[PDB]
Symmetry: D2
Subunit: 286 residues, 4 copies
C-alpha cells in the first residue's frame, strides 16, 4: 500500500488514515486499535456465564485501567482524558506526580512557560483545600491519595477538568506520588507557618487497586508514557501477570498486548477516534 | 488553549489543527512550518539585488535540500517525497544506503515483510543495470552515485517513483553509501560469477554537492531522521526521534508529522521562481 | 596523552588511571571525584563561622545525600553502598521501590535470575514484619517509610546489609514508593487472607527530608541512575546512562565508574568531623 | 556473589574483576570474553580437516574483523587498537569517517578541544599526500579507501599510529566514508586552487571485504559503537548471515554472539586484558 498522494489535494481524514496504514509503527497502532475495541466489546462466553455463581452481582465486562504521565496532562491530551472519564469509558486511572495539579491549574488560566500568578492561584487553592480538611474533616485518621483526589474533584466543580468528572462518575484515580508534586510543596509551605496535621496513607490505595484487578471478570490496561504503573497486575490467582488486554504507548498466559513506539499526544487522539469515540462499551448486564 | 473535544464529533481537520496547538512538540512543528514557508517564499532584498553582477543568470531564490534516511523510504513518506520532486519543491536530495533500492522495489510489488519474489525481481533489475553500465563506463571518469541514480531513474521510467521524477526534473540525489545497500549485494553476487568491473567514484559527487551550496544565493535544509548529511544553512528544519540562521529541531517521528507539515507548506505555498 | 599501552603488560592500576585520563567521559569522571572530595573536606570560612549564633550545636560540615535506584541495589554496588553507610560517609539516602527488599534478599541467598526459595524466604520475612508492625502502630501517627526501613534494619541485624548499618549509624533512608515494590506485594497477599491494617504515612517523611536540607550548613548530593529525587545543592554529582553550585553530569554506567570514584574519594579522603 | 568490599582496602585488580562478576551487564561482558577467546583459539575439527582439498593453502583459523567508530579513535582506545594491529591480533578493520585522520593527528600533537594549529598541520600533511599522488602515482585509475590508507600508513611511518602498523602487518582497513571526513575537506580545499584529479572507487573495496568473508574458513566479528559495518556478512553460500563468532559493544545458524550494552572505552580494555593480551592466537598452520 502507498502513502498519501498530495496530487489529490488535501484531505485530512485520508491523511490520518494513510498514517495508520503506511506510517512508521502503523502496524502496532492498528493492533492497539483492535485491542482497545476488544476491551470495550468483551462479553462472557456461554461457558463462562455458567461459571458465575448465584449472588455474583459484578458487571460481567472488561474493567479498563487508564495510566498516563503528568506530562500528558500538560498537553491537550488532558481534554481527551476528560472526555473518556466524562463518558465512563474507563474505570480507573493511575497517574504520576503533578498530573492532578495541572488539571486544576488549567481551570484557572491557559499555560503558554507557566505564568507566576497561575502557579500562585493554584497553590492558594490547594492550600485552602488542605486547611479546610483540617478545620472540618477529622484529621486523626489519614486520607489516601484517591480519596483526596475525589474531594478535590468535588470541590473544583469544573466540567472541563478530569477530576471533577472522575468524582461525578465514581472513577477512582490513584496517584501514590501525589505528595511529591505541587500538592506536597503546598504541604511544606503550609507547615512552615501552621503545623500541617494532614496524613497520607498509601496502603489503602494499594489494597483498592489490587482488589479491583483480583476481583474483576476481565482486565484491560492502557498506559501512556513511561513510569506510570506496573504492567504486571495481580490476577485472581495471586500471580502478578499481564492483563487480558494491554496497550502500551511511549517513546521509550493468553494475554493480548502491543507496545506502540510513538508519542501519545499525537497518536492517542487518532486511536481514540477509532475506538472510544465510535465503539459502544458493553454495559456488563447479562 | 484546550486540546480536541470529542464531544464535538470526529473532525479530522480539527484533530490535526488541535495537535498543532496542544500536542507535545507542537511549538516546534509550528516553527518548522514557518521556516519551510520562508524557504519557498524567500526573495532578495533591493540591497541584495544590487550586489548581483551583470551576467549572473542564477535563479534568485532559496535552494532547498531534502535529506531522509532509507527507513523513511520504507514508510509511506516515499510517496510524499515523490510528490515533492515531481513538483520541483526541492532541488537536491541526500539519502542513505538502501533508499534507492526501496523506491525501485515499490514499483514492482507492495511491501506488507518483503516477499521473496519481490526482492528477486528488484535484484534482477539492479543486476541488469550494473552489467549494462559496466560496458559504457569511462574508466578515466567513472560514474558517481548521483550519476548512477539519475540513470536508474531514467531506466525505471515509473511515475510512482522518486528517482524517475528526480531524473525528469534534474534533481540530483546524493548517496555516498549506495554500494553499502542492496545495490552492493547485487555487485557481490554478480562478482562470484564473472568479476565485476563497475567502478563508483565519490570525489566528483563531493565536488558536485559543494558547488551547489557555494553557488546558491540562499540555502534551505530539511533533514528527516538521524545520520544523513554533514555540513550552515540560512534555514534549517531537523526532524527525528533522537549567525542569522533560522532553524528548529523537531523531536517527532517524521512519517507522522512530516505529511502534516507538507500540507501546511509545500502543498499550499507557491514557490518563488527566482526570476527578478 | 595516550591510552593504556598493553606492551607494558597488564597493570590494573595503570588501566584504571589510563581510563580516568583518556576514556570517553573521563573529564566528567575527574570532576565528579574533585566535587565529592570537596563535599568531604568542606569547612566554614572564618567569615562564615562568625555568622553562627551561640547555642548552634550543629556539625559545621557538608551534609551528604546519596541517591540510587533499585537497579543499582541488584548489582554489586549494594556492597559499595553498605560500606559508605557503615563508615558514615553519607548522611541520607533516597532510593526507589524494590531497593530495600533486594538488600534484605541478598542476606538470605545469592542472586545469579532469582531462586524461587529466595523470594519465598524474603516474602516470609517481610510478611512477619508487616504483621508485627500492625500490632504496635499508632493510628494517629502511622509509621513512615523511613521509620519502617529503620526498624527493618534493626530487625534484620545483618552486617552485610545497607539497612542494618543505616539504622546503626542513624542514616535515614527515604523511599516514598516503598509500597510499590515487593513490600507491597506482601501486603496484597497478606490482605487476601486477613485484611491488612498497616498504614504508611508520607507527609511526615516529606517533613523530615525538608528539615534536613533546611537545617544543614552545606549540602552535597550524589545521584546514581534516573528517576530518584526531586529538589539546589552546593555540590552535586549526577551519574546515569540517560548560582555558585558546583556540579557535573557523568554519562556512564554507575556500577562500573562509581567504584572507581569511591576508590579516589570516600576510600582515601578523610571526612571533616564538623567540630569547629 | 557480592561486589567489591572496600573494607579490605584498595585493590584495582580485584575492583576490575569485581565488575566482571557483579556489575551491570557483567554476564554479557563475560560471554564477550569467552567468545573472543574462541575466535583466537579456534581450530578445524578432524572431520573439518578432511573436507579441505589439496592445494587449499589458506590459513585454517578464524579470520577476525575489528570495527570501531571514529569516536573510539579519539579516545585512548586508539592505542589499544594500535596494540591489536601491531601484534596481528586482527585481520581486517572497518571504521568510519574521521578515524584515519584522528590517528594521524595524534602523531603530531595531543588533543586536549582541538588546537587550531593541530588541525592545520594535519590538513597540510593530508594535502601534501594528495598532491604527491597526483605528481608521482598514476591518476588515470582510481584508488580505493583501503589502498589510500595503506599508502598513508607507509608515508606516516610512526609506530604509535594504527595505520602505520596496519600497513606493516598487511591488515587492510576499510573506510567507505573516507571522503566524508577531514580527508574530503582537504580534497575540497585543494580543488578550489588546483583541480583535484584524485578519484576514489568503492566497488573494489566492496569486493575485497566480501571476498574475504566468503573465502575464510571461520569468521569472527567485533564491533564497537553504532553505525560501523553490517552485522550480517556474506557466507560462502552467498547468504548474508551473522558471523560464526560475534561481539557487539555499544551504548545503544549456529552463530555464537553477544550484545554488550556498555561504553567500549571503559569495558573494551578490560576485555582485551582477558583475551588478546593473554590468549595466544592460533597460527592456522595445520
Ligand atoms: Cl466495570
Ligand atoms: Cl534553485
Ligand atoms: Cl552532618
Ligand atoms: Cl587469517
Amino acid at each position: 500500500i502507498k502513502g498519501y498522494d498530495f496530487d489529490k489535494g488535501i484531505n485530512y481524514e485520508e491523511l490520518v488514515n494513510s498514517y495508520l496504514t503506511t506510517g512508521i509503527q502503523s502496524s502496532n497502532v492498528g493492533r492497539a486499535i483492535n485491542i482497545i475495541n476488544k476491551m470495550l466489546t468483551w462479553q462472557p462466553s456461554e461457558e463462562e456465564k455458567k461459571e458465575y455463581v448465584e449472588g455474583d452481582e459484578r458487571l460481567k465486562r472488561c474493567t479498563i485501567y487508564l495510566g498516563f504521565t503528568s506530562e500528558m496532562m500538560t498537553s491537550g491530551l488532558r481534554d481527551t482524558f476528560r472526555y473518556l472519564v466524562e463518558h465512563k469509558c474507563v474505570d480507573y486511572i493511575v497517574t504520576t506526580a503533578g498530573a492532578i495539579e495541572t488539571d486544576i491549574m488549567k481551570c484557572f488560566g491557559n499555560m503558554n512557560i507557566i505564568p507566576k500568578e497561575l502557579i500562585e492561584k493554584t497553590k492558594q487553592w490547594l492550600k485552602e483545600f488542605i486547611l479546610d480538611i483540617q478545620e472540618c474533616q477529622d484529621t486523626s485518621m489519614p486520607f489516601t491519595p484517591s480519596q483526596l483526589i475525589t474531594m478535590m474533584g468535588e470541590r473544583l466543580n469544573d466540567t472541563t477538568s478530569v477530576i471533577t468528572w472522575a468524582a461525578k462518575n465514581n472513577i477512582t484515580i490513584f496517584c501514590p506520588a501525589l505528595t511529591d508534586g505541587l500538592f506536597g510543596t503546598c504541604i511544606t509551605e503550609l507547615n512552615e507557618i501552621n503545623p500541617v496535621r494532614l496524613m497520607v496513607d498509601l496502603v489503602q490505595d494499594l489494597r483498592l487497586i489490587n482488589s479491583s484487578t483480583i476481583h474483576s471478570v476481565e482486565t484491560g490496561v492502557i498506559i501512556l508514557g513511561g513510569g506510570v504503573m506496573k504492567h504486571h497486575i495481580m490476577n485472581a490467582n495471586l500471580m502478578r501477570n499481564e492483563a487480558d488486554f494491554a496497550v502500551y504507548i511511549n517513546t521509550a498466559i493468553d494475554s493480548e498486548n502491543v507496545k506502540v513506539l510513538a508519542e501519545a499526544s499525537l497518536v492517542f487522539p487518532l486511536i481514540v477516534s477509532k475506538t472510544f469515540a465510535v465503539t459502544k462499551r458493553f454495559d456488563g448486564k447479562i
